[PDB]
UniProtKB/Swiss-Prot annotation, chain A:
Taxonomic path: Bacteria, Pseudomonadati, Pseudomonadota, Gammaproteobacteria, Enterobacterales
Self-association state and partner proteins as the record states: The RNAP catalytic core consists of 2 alpha, 1 beta, 1 beta' and 1 omega subunit. When a sigma factor is associated with the core the holoenzyme is formed, which can initiate transcription. The rRNA transcription and antitermination complex (rrnTAC) consists of RNAP, NusA, NusB, NusE (rpsJ), NusG, SubB, ribosomal protein S4, DNA and precursor rRNA; S4 is more flexible than other subunits. In pull-down experiments interacts with CedA. (Microbial infection) Interacts (via flap domain) with Escherichia phage lambda antitermination protein Q; this interaction renders bacterial RNAP resistant to transcription pausing and allows it to read through termination signals.
Similarity field: Belongs to the RNA polymerase beta chain family.
Role, per record: DNA-dependent RNA polymerase (RNAP) catalyzes the transcription of DNA into RNA using the four ribonucleoside triphosphates as substrates.
Species this protein is from: Escherichia coli (strain K12)
This protein's encoding gene: rpoB
Protein modification: Acetylated on several lysine residues in the presence of glucose.
Name of the protein described by the UniProt record: DNA-directed RNA polymerase subunit beta
Domain of life: Bacteria
Segment of the intact protein contained: 1046 to 1094 of 1342
UniProtKB/Swiss-Prot annotation, chain B:
Keyword Cytoplasm: no
Full-sequence portion shown in this chain: 7 to 236 of 329
Protein name per its UniProtKB record: DNA-directed RNA polymerase subunit alpha
UniProt KW Acetylation keyword: yes
Phenotype when changing residue 159 to K: 5-fold decrease in CRP-class II promoter-dependent transcription
Amino acid sequence: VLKIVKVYLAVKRRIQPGDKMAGRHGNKGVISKINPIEDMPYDENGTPV
Amino acid sequence: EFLKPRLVDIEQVSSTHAKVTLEPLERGFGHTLGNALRRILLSSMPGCAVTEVEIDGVLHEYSTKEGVQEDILEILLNLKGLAVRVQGKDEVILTLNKSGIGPVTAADITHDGDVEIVKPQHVICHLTDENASISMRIKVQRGRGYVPASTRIHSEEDERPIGRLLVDACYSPVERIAYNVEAARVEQRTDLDKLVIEMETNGTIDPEEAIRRAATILAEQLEAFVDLRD
């Protein structure tokens, strides 16, 4: 090998459907769909979950 | 047959918090109007947001300069939450210029006649060196919804300058919407309720203009229903 060129690629990979997400207690799962913020059920104060 | 809801007192318990009341609303319509306005406000609100930032010292998001205690990615993240109103222009380019030790906040941005910073205490970064200087070109443009920098980057094909950094623009001005329908008691008509919409917004959009825009969008949508194409 005459020379070596190393290149670092930084991908800002965002969360999306299909990614595996879980809890500490063992509850697991795959994100099904990212709904718009309005579609979330919301409390009386109005904070959507 | 019906009585007509009218914009009544719109109080401001805070600069970012607005309580807007609609008194003369028929019972059975309060929840309909409340839900519709909540959806429209969370979805189709026009607003001003930062899209692209040009920092002189850096070439990409994952580098750092001298005399700053926050990573360039952190400056971009802080700018994401920057609250700004532009009146005349759809796209503006603000210039941030400051040297010397101290917290570089939003008020340090060179303010034009059409650009208003409603959150001047919003910290952008911290300069921890006497000779450290920050010069940035912040592009703020108008839009609605959520347009991340992974969709217009496919419509730009690797934007030619490498010194510019694209950030995901959350144009939504409103952060929280709630509506309460309560029994509005008034002499005329025994069955009426009022809708109290409690709104938390980044201060870029006035609640009156907010409700008016939501109603305009809803009416434009209903226009198709009014006249059916057969």
